[PDB]
């Protein structure tokens, strides 16, 4: 059993580490707006969008009952960006940087839970 406040305490530092990456987190701080970004097929490819602001709202409001649900949303966010964007693109490379940061942060946290 994990209380919501125990999950905020343990997991919020791993989310803050992503926000601290500038400019790499900037494309991830708000939901992808396909009209603004000129990517009209985005929602054909990405069926379940996810981003930092949505993960933060779910963690703050206590919507994760177990740590693996939070980790799954972080990886969904990353995978959506690797799927949609080309491997040579700026956002794809930013995604890979954030994933490296996340792996280093989340692994010790999950060992302690």
């Amino acid at each position: 059993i994990f209380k919501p406040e125990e999950l905020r305490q343990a997991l919020m530092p791993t989310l803050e580490a992503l926000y601290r990456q500038d400019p790499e987190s900037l494309p991830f701080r708000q939901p992808v707006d396909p009209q603004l970004l000129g990517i009209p097929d985005y929602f054909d490819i990405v069926k379940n969008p996810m981003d930092l602001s949505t993960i933060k709202r779910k963690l703050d409001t206590g919507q994760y009952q177990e740590p693996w649900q939070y980790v799954d949303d972080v990886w969904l966010m990353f995978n959506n960006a690797w799927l949609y964007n080309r491997k040579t693109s700026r956002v794809y490379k930013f995604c890979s940087k954030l994933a490296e940061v996340f792996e280093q942060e989340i692994d010790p946290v999950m060992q302690s839970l």
Binding site: P27, L37, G38, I39, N85, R86, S89, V91
Partner: peptide
């Protein structure tokens, strides 16, 4: 993929 984010 046709489009890149702009």
């Amino acid at each position: 993929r046709r489009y890149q984010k702009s």
